[PDB]
Design a protein around this ligand. Sequence first.
Ligand SMILES: Nc1ncnc2c1ncn2[C@@H]1O[C@H](COP(=O)(O)OP(=O)(O)O)[C@@H](O)[C@H]1O
Length: 157
Amino acid sequence: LEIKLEEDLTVIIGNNGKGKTSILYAIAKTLSWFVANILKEGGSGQRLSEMTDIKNDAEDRYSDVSSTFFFGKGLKSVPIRLSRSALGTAERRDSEVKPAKDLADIWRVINEVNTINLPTFALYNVERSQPFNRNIKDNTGRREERFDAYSQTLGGA
DNA sequence: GGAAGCGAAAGTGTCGCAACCCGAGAGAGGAACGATCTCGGGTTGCGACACTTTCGCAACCCTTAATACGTTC
RNA sequence: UAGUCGGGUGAUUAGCCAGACUCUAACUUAUUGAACGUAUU
Ligand SMILES: Nc1ncnc2c1ncn2[C@@H]1O[C@H](COP(=O)(O)OP(=O)(O)O)[C@@H](O)[C@H]1O
């Protein structure tokens, strides 16, 4: 499948079980690498599942999620591919996540020397809308700290 | 292909809390014996969370290269 | 309208001017090796 998302707004529609949540899940998995490498140097983002993400009746027994990002005319293409081979397969498939690491390294290093505005990556799945009680006192982490805005930002809730 | 670090992802054990049960006990009433509510352990079920295992990113570039100037793989 | 092509000007990778295009739709890449162009030769 191939998608040509718009710059400002993209709306995916269809029946139930057509793969819209799959597309959003793949995009969030791709963006987790940007978030992880913004937070840490060489940080590891989320990866495709080897139990449920590979097509059940695929012959190859691996799955790919390729993406291309645009960051202006000076950086027109940032290709990142997330791959996973099925469970119990001798040949494993690697992920090409180097360009995302490079872009996030640029962001983080430039931010360290002089504060710059950082991009916001957020996923709001169906996993939200759970009840909300004010049960969060010792929640460990410091909410004023600037880089707390990336904590659990692609979890869904 | 894959050091060395490290973290994601998934599975499994564990451990504390709630909920209930069950015997002991002081003693309500009203004229005695012991109702009824509570104290102290004890058991079980359950679910959040800690702990455990596996995978994967990607150093280096091996003895072993050539060195007019430019694109391309 | 975007986006793209690029003839001119421009101490010139920028800015501007004229013109043109539009399959749902470029993202310019790699040496010393191979071939191509060029120079010595
Ligand atoms: N590994 C798989 N192999 C084959 N089909 C799958 C696999 N994983 C999910 N599906 C199918 O893809 C659909 C997933 O639904 P989803 O992406 O949430 O769609 P929606 O947004 O329309 O509700 C289901 O119809 C499910 O049967």
